[PDB]
Every structure is written in C-alpha cells, then in structure tokens.
Amino acid sequence: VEPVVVIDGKGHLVGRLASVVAKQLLNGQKIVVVRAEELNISGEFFRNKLKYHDFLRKATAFNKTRGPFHFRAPSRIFYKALRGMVSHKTARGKAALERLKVFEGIPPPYDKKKRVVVPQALRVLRLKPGRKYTTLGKLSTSVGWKYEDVVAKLEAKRKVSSAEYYAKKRAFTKKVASANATAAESDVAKQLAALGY
Amino acid sequence: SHRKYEAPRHGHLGFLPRKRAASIRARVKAFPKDDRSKPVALTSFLGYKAGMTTIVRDLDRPGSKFHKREVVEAVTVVDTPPVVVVGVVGYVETPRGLRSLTTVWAEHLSDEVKRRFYKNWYKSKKKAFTKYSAKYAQDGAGIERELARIKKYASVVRVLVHTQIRKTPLAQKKAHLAEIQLNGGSISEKVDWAREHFEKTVAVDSVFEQNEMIDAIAVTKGHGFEGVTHRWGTKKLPRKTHRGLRKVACIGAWHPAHVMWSVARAGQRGYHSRTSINHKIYRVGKGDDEANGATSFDRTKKTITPMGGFVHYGEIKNDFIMVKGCIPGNRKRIVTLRKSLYTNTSRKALEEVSLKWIDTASKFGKGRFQTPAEKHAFMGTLKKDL
Amino acid sequence: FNSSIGRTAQGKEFGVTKARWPAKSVKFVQGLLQNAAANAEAKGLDATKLYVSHIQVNQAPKQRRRTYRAHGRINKYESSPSHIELVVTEKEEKVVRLTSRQRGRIAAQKRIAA
RNA sequence: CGUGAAAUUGUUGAAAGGGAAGGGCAUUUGAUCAGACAGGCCAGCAUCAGUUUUGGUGGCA
RNA sequence: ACUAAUCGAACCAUCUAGUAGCUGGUUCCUGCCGAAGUUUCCCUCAGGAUAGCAGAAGCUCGUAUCAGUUUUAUGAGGUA
RNA sequence: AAGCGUGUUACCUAUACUCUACCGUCAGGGUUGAUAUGAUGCCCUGACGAGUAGGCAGGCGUGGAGGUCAGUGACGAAGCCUAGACCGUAAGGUCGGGUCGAACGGCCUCUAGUGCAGAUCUUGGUGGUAGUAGCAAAUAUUCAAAUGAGAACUUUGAAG
RNA sequence: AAGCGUUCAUAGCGACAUUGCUUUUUGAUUCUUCGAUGUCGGCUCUUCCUAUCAUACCGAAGCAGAAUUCGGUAAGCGUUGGAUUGUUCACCCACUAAUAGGGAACGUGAGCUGGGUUUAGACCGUCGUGAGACAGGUUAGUUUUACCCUACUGAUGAAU
RNA sequence: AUUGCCGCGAAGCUACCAUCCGCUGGAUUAUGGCUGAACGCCUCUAAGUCAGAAUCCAUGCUAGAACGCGGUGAUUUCUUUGCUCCACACAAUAUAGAUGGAUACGAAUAAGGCGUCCUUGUGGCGUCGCUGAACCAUAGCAGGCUAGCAACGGUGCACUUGGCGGAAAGGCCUUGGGUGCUUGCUGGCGAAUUGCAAUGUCAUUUUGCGUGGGGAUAAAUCAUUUGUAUACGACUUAGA
Ligand SMILES: [Mg+2]
Ligand SMILES: [Mg+2]
Ligand SMILES: [Mg+2]
Ligand SMILES: [Mg+2]
Ligand SMILES: [Mg+2]
Ligand SMILES: [Mg+2]
Ligand SMILES: [Mg+2]
Ligand SMILES: [Mg+2]
Ligand SMILES: [Mg+2]
Ligand SMILES: [Mg+2]
Ligand SMILES: [Mg+2]
Ligand SMILES: [Mg+2]
Ligand SMILES: [Mg+2]
Ligand SMILES: [Mg+2]
Ligand SMILES: [Mg+2]
Ligand SMILES: [Mg+2]
Ligand SMILES: [Mg+2]
Ligand SMILES: [Mg+2]
Ligand SMILES: [Mg+2]
Ligand SMILES: [Mg+2]
Ligand SMILES: [Mg+2]
Ligand SMILES: [Mg+2]
Ligand SMILES: [Mg+2]
Ligand SMILES: [Mg+2]
Ligand SMILES: [Mg+2]
Ligand SMILES: [Mg+2]
Ligand SMILES: [Mg+2]
Ligand SMILES: [Mg+2]
Ligand SMILES: [Mg+2]
Ligand SMILES: [Mg+2]
Ligand SMILES: [Mg+2]
Ligand SMILES: [Mg+2]
Ligand SMILES: [Mg+2]
Ligand SMILES: [Mg+2]
Ligand SMILES: [Mg+2]
Ligand SMILES: [Mg+2]
Ligand SMILES: [Mg+2]
Ligand SMILES: [Mg+2]
Ligand SMILES: [Mg+2]
Ligand SMILES: [Mg+2]
Ligand SMILES: [Mg+2]
Ligand SMILES: [Mg+2]
Ligand SMILES: [Mg+2]
Description:
Chain C: It is found in: Cytoplasm. The structure is cut from a larger assembly and holds chains A (about 200 residues), B (about 375 residues) and C (about 110 residues). Chain A is about 50% helix and about 10% strand. Chain A has eight helices and five strands, in the order E-H-E-E-H-H-H-E-H-E-H-H-H. Chain A has a three-stranded parallel beta sheet with strand order 1-2-4, covered by helices on one side. In chain A, strands 3-5 form a two-stranded antiparallel sheet. In chain A, helix 1 (about 15-25) crosses helix 3 (about 75-80). The two termini of chain A are about 25 Å apart. Chain B is mainly beta. Chain B has two domains: about 15-80 and about 205-220 and about 270-385, Elongation Factor Tu (Ef-tu), domain 3 (Beta Barrel), CATH 2.40.30.10; about 80-200, Ribosomal Protein L3, Chain: B, domain 2 (2-Layer Sandwich), CATH 3.30.1430.10. In chain B, strands 1, 4, 5, 6, 7 and 8 form a six-stranded antiparallel beta sheet that branches. A six-stranded antiparallel beta barrel of chain B has the order 2-3-13-12-9-14. In chain B, strands 10-11 form a two-stranded antiparallel sheet. The termini of chain B are far apart. With about 110 residues, chain C is an alpha+beta fold. Chain C has one domain. Helix content of chain C is about 30%, strand content about 25%. Chain C has two helices and four strands, in the order H-E-E-E-E-H. In chain C, strands 1-4 form a two-stranded antiparallel sheet. In chain C, strands 2-3 form a two-stranded antiparallel sheet. Chain C is elongated and about 95 Å long. The interface between A and B is medium-sized, with 14 and 10 residues. One magnesium ion (MG) binds near residues 240 and 242 of chain B. The structure holds five RNA strands.
C-alpha cells in the first residue's frame, strides 16, 4: 500500500518472486528490488549453470549482435525472469516495466528506506529442507558478471553504517518503551486498555 | 553437403568489426596490475613513430646455433620528448563499473594543449581554462578541496599528460592529451605525485629502461576501401571466372537465408586500433647529447637520425625509444608505449641487449654511407664549392 | 527526391547529408524572385520587409522524346518541366456554465475570502 | 480554351510513426455537428413486476 | 538449310466469331431452402447420359397407410 | 511444484442452455349490421434463424418508352467535390455548402447493348523504381579576341 | 551368452536369436511445385553435427618397454599434395600429428566453370522393311539481368 | 610511334619471396582420490570435499548501446539590450494515475529478536512471536475568530552551528535563536440557500510570458588549408 515497495531480494526464489512482481506492476504498483545477487534458484549450482549455458548457446546465427542478449548480472537475470510474465511487447507492458528498478546491493536512496519480503516466494518458506539451491551472485560470476567483489565490498560498508544506525535506534526505542512503561496504571492508560489500546 | 576438403578460416573473428577507429590516438584498454609497495610511477608514455632503422648485436641465447655471434635485426624509433603533466583524475569503484568522480587541472596550461580543446584556434578568444585559473587566486582553496576528494574516494588515480609536439618535427602544433594510470603507492601518494608534477615534464627514461618488454598501442595505417582478396586473404578465383575474380565465390548456403557475419566481405582495411605486446626496448636514447646512434663498438659522433633525415618525418632532437621489430601504425603517428601486463621470463625477455652498430644510412634510397664524413672520405673532393 | 544522391559537407547547415547545387533550378527561381520584387516595387511594397510567404512548384506536362534500347526496343526519354509560382509579402508585426453546486461553492469561497 | 473526376503531385493546415500499413469491438482525448422548452438531456431514491445471484434465520422427515 | 529478322511447308486476305470433354473470367442487395463426389451404361477413366441427393410449383385431404426406436411373438444367418 | 497418481470444493468463460426485448421467416388464427374507410390492411398466438455448388422470393440502381405529378430549373437543371447532416439491415436514397451553366426528376407501367476488382481482360492516363541505370569504343585538346542575355561546344587567330 | 581366446563366455571377439537408433544409401508413396524453385561434378567460402582420424586429459588389456587394441570427457583445434577418371564413388604414389564421417534446397550457376547428362549437326555397333531406337560408345554444340527490399561488409547522421 | 622500346630507377604499395609480435587466472568434464553413512564391515557419494581436459568463464584483445552512463573546459549585448539562476504574477500544456506516513540493522531458520546480569561466552535468566489486524499519525469555516488554565513540551516556517554520507552521495543527524500553531485541559462566537447526490476542483511536471534581484561576455559549421585520412560524407591538420 506504500507508494514505492522495496523488496529485499535475499532468500527469495527467482521465479516465485518475479511472478509476484509481475502481477504488482500490471496492477499499478511501483516495485524496487535490491540485493538481487542474493536471490535463489532451486536446484544445484551446476544444474543451474548448465541451464545458463544452454541459454548462452542460443544466438542468431547470421549476426550475434542482433540475437538474444545474455545478460550476466543478477539484477538483469532477474529482469529476464520478469519478462515472460509481462507482455513486454505492448504499451501496457512497457508501462509496467517502467515501474520496476532492480539493483545489486542496496544503492542510495534505498539504503535508508524500509525493505520488505515476499513470504509467498521466500526460499526458507517454500523449499523443502534438504533441497539444494543456488545463489544468483555465484551463478552470475560463473558466467561473466564482473562486480561480485565490489558489491560485496560496498555492502559491507553499508552494513556497518546500518548497524550503527540500529544501535542509535535500539537506544531510542528502549527509552520510548520505558516512557510507555511508566505511563501505565494512569487514568488514560486504563481507559485505552479497556478499549483495546 | 560437407566442404569436401578442410581448410582453416580466412581471417580472425576477434578483430571485428574491421571499421575505422573512433580516434587517431588509440586508447589504452588495460593498465598493468598495480603493486602498492613500489614507488609511484607512470605506466605508459606517448610518442610519435619516426621510422625504422637496423642494428647489429651479439645474440646471447644459449642453445641457439647463432649463439655468441652477430645478428641483424630491424628496430622502430619513436620520438618521445618529455610529456607535460597537467592534471589528475580519480576513479571510484562502482557496481556499474569504474567511474570518474572529479578532475583537477594545473594552474597554467601551455598553448599547445589549449589548442586541443579547440577546432578553430585562430578564431577563438582563447578563453579556455580562464575561470579555472582564477581558482588558484587566494591559496588555491578550491583545488585542495578537490584533491582531498580524490584522496578520500577514488580507488584508482590517473594522470593527465600531453605531448610536447612543439619539439617534434611535426606539422600539427597541437598536443595529444591522454590518461595514464599511476601505479604504486597509496591513493594519497598518487595524488601527492600528481600535485608535485603539475606543470612539470616527465622524461621517458623515468618510465622505461633498456631490455624491458613493452606494449605498442596505435591505430594502424589506413588503406581505404579494400576487396576480400587483400582484406581477408581469400583465394583468388581462376582466370576463367566471369564477372570478377577478386571475390569470394560462395557467401553462404541457401539456409540460413542470410549472409552470416563470419563471411569475408569487402570494406575498410586499416586504420584499426591494435595492441601488440612483447616488444623489447633496445635503446632508451637521450636527446640532450650527441652520439645518439653511437654504440660501445662504434664510437662515431653520429645521432640516431639517418643520413638525410627520417623519411616523411624529420630529424630527432629529443629523447627516443628504440624498440625491436615493428609496431602498429605508420610514421608521424601517435603511439602509446605501455608497460607489460605480465612478467615474462622465457629467455627472450631477461636477455640483456648490447648494441654494436646502429644503421644511419639514408632511408631515402640505397644509402651506402653512414655519416657525411664517411661520404667525403670515400668520394673525396667534389666540384661543389665552399 | 534524394535517394542515392551523394553526400556533402554543406548539408550540415540544414542537418542533412544529401544536398546538391541545382544551378538550372536556381536561375529559374531567382528570375521569378527578381520579377516578384519588381511587382512589389510597382505595387508600392516596402522591399526591406519582404519575405517569401508562398512558393509552390508543380509538375508541368511532360515533353516527349524517344530513346533506343537493345534488341530493337524504344523507350520514352521525357522531360519533367515545372510550373512555378511564388508570392512575397511584408513581415507583419466565452460563456461558462456552472451547476447549482458549483455556484454555491464559488459563493462559499467568496464570503470567506479576504 | 464548356464542365473538369480518379490514379499521381505541389503548397498549407491537422494528426500519428521503436522491423510494414490498413481493419473489428469498446472507451479516453482532440476536432466537428444535428435536434428540443408551447417534455428535451443526464441522474438519485421509494414501492412493484420479470429473470437471476449472494447471504441470515425458522419449522419438519 | 535457305526461300525479305518468317521455314519439318513463307507472307497476305477470306472461309472464320473454325472446333475445344481443356485454362481463365463471368458485374446489385437482402430473405428462405439447401447438396454431391455414389448406382448402371458409354472408344468410358479431366466427359456425358441414368438413378439418387436439392429447389420450386403445388394438388388431394385433415391426424391417418406411418417411424434410421423399443417391446412381445415367430423366422433367418455360420462371423467373434 | 507451478512435476506425477488420486480425492474434495470454490472459481473463470462459448455465437451452447434459461429469461426478456427487437428484426425477419414459417405456421395457426381473429377482424364487415360504419372493419369506426388500407382485408396482398390491422392485429393475436407459437415456433424457428449456420451454409459452398445450386434453386426460389422480395427489393435497390442505370439507358430508353406510354401515362401522370397543369413535377424541378438561368432567382440556377444536370454533373463533379465535400473526415457536414438525416433515412434504410443493405443494394441505396435524401439534404446543406462549394463549383458549374441547360436541361432533369417522383410515382404507375413497358423495354434492354442494364450494375465489375480480377479475365498475363481492351483503350487511354499515371506511379514507385528514380533524379536512379546510365550519357566510358574511334589517342585531344588549350589560350585570347569577336558575337551574344547567356559560350567547354559559334566565328577568327595562335598552339597542340 | 553356445563357443573362440593354451586353460578363461564377456582383455578382445562372439553363433542361434532378439530390442533399437539414423535419414549422408537405395527402395516405397505421389502431398507441394508443369502461367518452370536453373537437374551432375568440381572450384570458392562460411557454418553446423558427432557416430573422434589426429591433438588434450584419462580408464581397460592376453598393457614388461616400445608399439598397439578397447572404452570415457571432448567438435576447442586441424584433417593434405598428386597420377588416372566429367565423375560422385574408386584406386595408387607420397607427405603428415591425422589424411574421420556427415549436414546446411543431395549448401553454394544473377558466384564461376561447363568435362557429364539433356535439343538441334555427324560417325560406329546392334535392332528395325522403313522412318527411326538404344539409362551403348564417339565428336561439335549462345550459361542473360540487381540500379529495388532485406541480410551482410564497411560509411554518414537529426534530436538529449 | 594509343606508356615506342631497352637498362637502371628513388618514393609509394607490397611478399612465409621480407621482418616483428601472438597474455595468464579461476571454475569444471571424464577420471583418480579424502573423509564418511546407508548396510556396526566396505564404499570417490548419499551430506561435505581435493586434484584435474586442447572444455568453460574471465584476464587480455576488437567494437562501443548512434534512445547506456560519468568527469572536466568554455559558454555569445553595445550583436532586433541577447543568455543563465532566484522569487512571484498570469496563460497554455499534459498526467500508465497523490488523496494521512515507502515506518531503514545484520544473520539464522533443525533458530532467532528484545530486556537484564556476570566471570564478556557459540554464557545465565526472563520474555516475545503464532503476522502490518501493527506502529506513528489522525478532532477545529479543506479546518475560521477569540478568552484563559496547565506545561516548557510537540510541531511548521524560513535562518543559523557542527558533523556524517560518493554505489546513483543530493540525504541523514544536529547546536542556537526568532516567529507562528497546538485538540494536554476549560470556555465564547461563526457556519445554513452547494437547497436530498453529482471528483465537487485543494495535486505535480513541462512550456512560455511579464515584473524585479544577482551572475558571465563564447564557440561550432561552411568556405580556404594538410595528408598520419579518404568513393562521397567523415577523419586528422593549419590560418587573424
Ligand atoms: Mg510471455
Ligand atoms: Mg564479455
Ligand atoms: Mg568432413
Ligand atoms: Mg581491458
Ligand atoms: Mg566464361
Ligand atoms: Mg625505402
Ligand atoms: Mg539506396
Ligand atoms: Mg550508383
Ligand atoms: Mg550516391
Ligand atoms: Mg540505347
Ligand atoms: Mg476547362
Ligand atoms: Mg487526387
Ligand atoms: Mg487499433
Ligand atoms: Mg470522440
Ligand atoms: Mg506451304
Ligand atoms: Mg466465341
Ligand atoms: Mg478462334
Ligand atoms: Mg437450413
Ligand atoms: Mg428434395
Ligand atoms: Mg461367412
Ligand atoms: Mg499453467
Ligand atoms: Mg440462412
Ligand atoms: Mg439503350
Ligand atoms: Mg447545380
Ligand atoms: Mg449554355
Ligand atoms: Mg453488358
Ligand atoms: Mg476497373
Ligand atoms: Mg548517376
Ligand atoms: Mg575517342
Ligand atoms: Mg493420394
Ligand atoms: Mg524463377
Ligand atoms: Mg561420442
Ligand atoms: Mg545441390
Ligand atoms: Mg544462387
Ligand atoms: Mg547462371
Ligand atoms: Mg559438353
Ligand atoms: Mg542492387
Ligand atoms: Mg551485382
Ligand atoms: Mg595511328
Ligand atoms: Mg620469416
Ligand atoms: Mg578409506
Ligand atoms: Mg555512443
Ligand atoms: Mg489537531
């Protein structure tokens, strides 16, 4: 119900999350995906690397520049999954795709915005325990994506500042909860409690 | 059905498209891997290919049947006057790729690099960098505000240099401006190097030494439109062939119903950027001295310039690099000399070279004298009057 | 009408690669411009403010000749003449309907506006 | 040289144009246009009839 | 081979709109009904006649002699 | 599992089914002492509607003919143009504006050389291709002057 | 898996049987093309497949070494020069690491060539009374057009 | 003498007929192994894992999306007194679709968060989840005028102090003062007629135009010219 919904791609199955995103864009929702390098695919890494090599060999024989485009980045791999669940050749499909941004890591300004998940598509909630899976960043680097290291480096710098921010927020919510704790037993507090608040 | 007889493909698919280069100055696509321990130094140099000469040297290659005996080898001379450092650029690592964050320039720029930013220099008011030259007014307070930015950020530091084309015998008057990655030392030390070297001249012997494997980066000689027989080296068709024989007979099967990208077809030949590697330096010649072309075994007070000047180029009055063999490009052409991207240890590298004799006969013909004194000695007195 | 014309540098003035120098066409046009400026002077029009407001070239009836082809064939060899006409000129220097509830809002805006 | 069509063309004006264009159903937008005051236009609610759909509850075997 | 760009029988005109079981085309709207490629015969097999299928005109009458169906009863058959 | 096997519901939507309206077709009927004058008219009731080849029926349009409207018209007939309007399911019909200049319609009948997208259809006209392919055999032209609106091409002189 | 393999079915083979795959054989069919998709071979050039000749790394052997044979991943990279023949096919000489097999309208004729087939001239043999016949031999015999669109190779370029 | 012929012939082009040069990292296949159950043993495999092919992906090389992006330089007056930035005044232009708030740890899930304590751990104890059904916010002529009480808070506006943030920072945390409002509590007045409903107009891009307050005072193309280029364009040069 937010004007922009930011989805943290970690722990998400790629086809189940992108089918969720496809319906949201066609229903008019702006969706931003971050940490697409942390997406997941069911099946072993070698099995998924074999499927990308079957994709890699598909090219227009008389001119490889006009053929299928094999995008290596996890955000663009995610985008290719989305296309196929969106009628991208129509004007409505191009308007839906204009409502989506995907990213490796969390660039600004999404670093300081709340991220959500899709339990309808989470790997830990959909896969059976003991089933092998694959991380998109590992798959992408195996097929020529060149920025796993700098994404991992810049994510570490972001996580340090984010952890520092949460400590200064843990302290503030601790004080706020203490002020609410002493506010109880008053005249207003007992009326709110009898009214469910 | 199959080809009925196997042959290797004509041409190399990795040098495609065989189109004209986007600029005459070929761009450096890769710099040597940076080792932070070493002192801060340039990784490339800019020079103008003057021409070729011939040397004699003793081969030091054990096992070779010509070991310890003289060989004659072709060399290429590139006029390399000391380039001027005029600026610095910092590059921040980004998931989208390397990206420049800011650039700093020297307070004063030479007219030969101010010409570069112009198409009509004579018509111009010469207004370039006038307001940037006012940033140095009080103490250059805006300049250290940007150098501190490069030091804090910018995991890569490059330096802006320009050639001293006013010293080379060219007819251009306008320098070539390039970026050279600055290897060694911390990010601060690279910026420290750049600040100390603003408005200064960096010589070629500070970058390169003798016997060093270096890379040549230049746009090759142009040949205009060319047919498939010379552009790709395909077989000439027989004499009986109607409607052309300098062609390719079959440019595809019926299916796929298209000409494929891998079929040899006519078009532009030459004027392509090329990066040739492993070119040993034979002489880091100094310009501020006679006996440029002298060796230990010659002791003749002659310069590197042949007897009558380099053909289509001119003399040499500056520092130069003698490099073994041929390098891409032609005479008068800007070339990038780049340090090796790997340490080669195959006894061709690591083979110290001592020149015995450098050919200084005229390349304008079948020149049979090295110096004017030698010509006057052999011929004697002529009718030409003093 | 420019398919398979040569390219020239002088088309940069107009943003095209294909431009030519139709000397015969230019002479006919500038003859008519000189005639129109004569009419403007005769009419009393001020020449420093004149500009080509309308110029139109139409297809005239064609002039027929023959050309002789291989294997005893005859094809047309035909001119494409022009009708030309041009004009020079001097450069020259709501009941609204509202419903009852719309008018009431405008009344309610005015009696509290300052 | 009566009238002076179409194919095809010029000028002007309007519109749209990521490897055709054209069309069918429906609507938005822009343009343009006909009629009616002695009911014309678009609607809201209540009580009914016809055809349905979705609930709540009651009594029996 | 050649016999006026014409030759295994020139050119011109007429008979001549020569015949063609063969190819192509066969021009307004709406409404109702609505097929056949199967029988026999033919120097028959790219055709026709004949019977069948279809339309139209109806006529004599007015719920029946009836029926791409079953049951009951009684036959027949020589395939699984 | 968004795979396989099986089971239970909910849901989606055909020009199919049900109900209603409207069109047409068919069938069965009503309707004359003013049917409160259309009896091939008005009205009631029920059912039905795919369609090539093909058959039949009812209509639209064109040239000319008999009759009629004592029809239209130089105060504009016919024609043509018109992302202007209306009527008809349709064939089509009617009107407004522009252009034009001399004849032309409605209705009842008669008559036919009577309706076109095709036939490598006929005749004529026009396109894209397209300012394109090309205007390259025969050795070769140049300078000045004259004439002229205009000279590579005319004339004369000089040269080759 | 009966046997061969000195003994030992399966190192390598493998009878009698039996299950398949492929569409580079040839049959079989006649669906497309008879207002025509240029019918052999070669040359040239690119690409694809693997049922791998060589090369890389391996596993097995009746692998002591050397050399071989069988098998795996594997089509990345190569797979030739000639005598004869129009030949595809074939055979031989020789080099080589190897001289593996195929597809792409039996790839490729507005790319060529035209030796062959396959028009019209002519000869021979057989057959036919004859005109003539012969997937029998022999010799001579016109190989057209791109300037359009796409594709491809190169070259400009408005707008930010 | 259609380049008359012959010998030599610079320059240019060109030759496995000449010379130079043609990079090294990771992940893997087959296979061989480690540990190790199923199956108390065994086992390269089931979970994990080592090495390893002319393989693959990178390094490197070629091109650079003409609708991918970045950094930097200069940006036109006495040249229809032009250009740019800021503010407010009026017009047009449209909206892939505002209608209180996109409300920020990280990791795991056969585990975690929060709080507390210690001997600072892979610790003890308590508690929570079982969905955001939350939290914050939210009363007033679309939100008026005004009197107080309590408190010294909340919050808006510009202004100011300091710091942090380069992945696309363009935002976050702040000090201090001024100026409003406050629904934390108690009052007084006003609202009607939009007539029984008509989104009943409150938003944000862009383009101009005018007004008044700052700021700067160029290039590019053609034409000429070069030949490191070239069919033409283009490219590379030069000219007050
Ligand atoms: Mg799809
Ligand atoms: Mg790549
Ligand atoms: Mg082969
Ligand atoms: Mg590179
Ligand atoms: Mg020929
Ligand atoms: Mg030379
Ligand atoms: Mg063209
Ligand atoms: Mg041409
Ligand atoms: Mg052209
Ligand atoms: Mg001709
Ligand atoms: Mg006329
Ligand atoms: Mg017309
Ligand atoms: Mg449409
Ligand atoms: Mg409309
Ligand atoms: Mg005769
Ligand atoms: Mg006839
Ligand atoms: Mg006839
Ligand atoms: Mg029927
Ligand atoms: Mg019948
Ligand atoms: Mg029987
Ligand atoms: Mg499905
Ligand atoms: Mg019908
Ligand atoms: Mg008639
Ligand atoms: Mg009239
Ligand atoms: Mg008249
Ligand atoms: Mg007729
Ligand atoms: Mg017609
Ligand atoms: Mg031409
Ligand atoms: Mg001639
Ligand atoms: Mg059949
Ligand atoms: Mg054909
Ligand atoms: Mg195999
Ligand atoms: Mg073929
Ligand atoms: Mg062909
Ligand atoms: Mg041909
Ligand atoms: Mg022949
Ligand atoms: Mg063409
Ligand atoms: Mg051609
Ligand atoms: Mg002669
Ligand atoms: Mg050699
Ligand atoms: Mg073990
Ligand atoms: Mg670009
Ligand atoms: Mg309030």
